[PDB]
């Protein structure tokens, strides 16, 4: 449809967003080869859900969404329908009727640092679980107790976000992993994000 999809601006960008403040790119009126997602680099995980991986280059959709963030290696299995943990409950939540794919690669060389990379952040605590595709950007103060704190940080009075700590000696599970959720949306009568075919 005369353009090719700027997926590169999302997969290979110099810096990724924190999972509590995850990014979303909306993709339209373009063509793309998902070939690439099968044959690729080490440490790639590439579970899929609504579609079979083999057929993506054939199908067409109204709109694709690219959500992207950094989470921690052993937490990459939260990123799948009907799943629990302090990521799926409090940071990034997929539905059950999830038509899409979940790509995720180690990035110790990009994101770790030799003093600690303390500027990737996650959400510790939330009164309620996140509804699917919700993005709670809130600072707050969370009371984990009894006494109210009226918006000050103290005992049992937690500032709700915490910094990951990324050293490159951490070993594969405490190591930063970049994650991208592609979402394939079939809606009204323009279907404008197709593959080579």
């Amino acid at each position, epitope marked *: 449809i005369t353009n090719l999809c700027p997926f*590169d601006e999302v997969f290979n960008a110099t810096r990724f967003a924190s999972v509590y403040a995850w990014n979303r790119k909306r993709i339209s009126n373009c063509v793309a080869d998902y070939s690439v997602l099968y044959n690729l680099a080490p440490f790639f995980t590439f579970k899929c859900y609504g579609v079979s991986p083999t057929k993506l280059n054939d199908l067409c959709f109204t709109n694709v969404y690219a959500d992207s963030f950094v989470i921690r290696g052993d937490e990459v299995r939260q990123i799948a329908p009907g799943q629990t943990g302090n990521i799926a409950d409090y940071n990034y939540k997929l539905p059950d009727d999830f038509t899409g794919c979940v790509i995720a690669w180690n990035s110790n060389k990009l994101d770790s640092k030799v003093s600690g990379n303390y500027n990737y952040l996650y959400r510790l605590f939330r009164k309620s679980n996140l509804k699917p595709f919700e993005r709670d950007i809130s600072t707050e103060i969370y009371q984990a107790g009894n006494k109210p704190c009226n918006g000050v940080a103290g005992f049992n009075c937690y500032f709700p976000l915490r910094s990951y700590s990324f050293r490159p000696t951490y070993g594969v599970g405490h190591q930063p992993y970049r994650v991208v959720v592609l979402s394939f949306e079939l809606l009204h009568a323009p279907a404008t994000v197709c593959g080579p075919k």
Partner: antibody, heavy 118, light 110 residues
């Protein structure tokens, strides 16, 4: 790693034309943007034109309309670059370079010297 | 029709010092799609910086690019003997429309 093998050095007599070639082993030749870059000796990189093979619509730089023509062939997955009406100003190294919609590197080929002289 | 314009033309700096190269556009620029090359004599351009910010494989730490919009900057922190070249800044879409800068020449001062 997907390799960009360019065709070999040439000598063309002035007034003629030349057709440099560029081949993509494997990958996804059809959905790259292929592009040709000139450097005359002692001077700076000049962008000449480019093509997405899956669209066969190529675009050229305003410095070259009447002379250059880019084409590309899905079957053997090579693009071509055809410069007409040559003169001594055109003695240069001619590089093809590709970018992909999955990554922000631009990848370069080997280079090809064209010498224009009798 | 983008016109990138490097500044200065020529840099003489004695070694170890702080090298700062400017690139300016005639419009604003997506900045994911802006690269930096070094060229030393008789060699092909070599990619240093892509996506305005990322260093390319093998390039030393003391090279670094930043900037946005209409104003991008390659910085060499600890300039060394072998570190004179012509530096080009390129802009490049996922479409057939790219451009380069006339270049910036860097050299050692004795």
């Amino acid at each position: 790693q997907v390799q960009l093998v360019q065709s070999g050095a040439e000598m063309k007599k002035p007034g003629s034309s030349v057709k440099v070639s560029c081949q993509a082993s494997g990958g996804t030749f059809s959905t790259y943007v292929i592009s040709w870059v000139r450097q005359a000796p002692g001077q700076g990189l000049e962008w000449m034109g480019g093509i997405i093979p899956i669209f066969n619509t190529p675009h050229y730089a305003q410095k070259f309309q009447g002379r250059v023509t880019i084409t590309a062939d899905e079957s053997t997955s090579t693009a071509y670059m055809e410069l007409s009406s040559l003169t001594s100003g055109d003695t240069a190294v001619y590089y093809c370079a590709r970018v992909s919609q999955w990554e922000l590197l631009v990848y370069w080929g080997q280079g090809t010297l064209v010498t224009v002289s009798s | 029709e983008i016109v990138l314009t490097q500044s200065p033309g020529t840099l003489s700096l004695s070694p170890g010092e702080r090298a700062t190269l400017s690139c300016r556009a005639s419009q604003s620029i997506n900045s994911n799609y802006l690269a930096w090359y070094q060229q030393k004599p008789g060699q092909a351009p070599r990619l240093l910086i892509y996506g305005a910010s990322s260093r390319a494989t093998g390039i030393p730490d003391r090279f670094s690019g930043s900037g946005s919009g209409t104003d991008f900057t390659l910085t060499i922190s600890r300039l060394e003997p072998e570190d004179f070249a012509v530096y080009y800044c390129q802009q490049y879409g996922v479409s057939p429309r790219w451009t380069f800068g006339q270049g910036t020449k860097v050299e050692i001062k004795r």
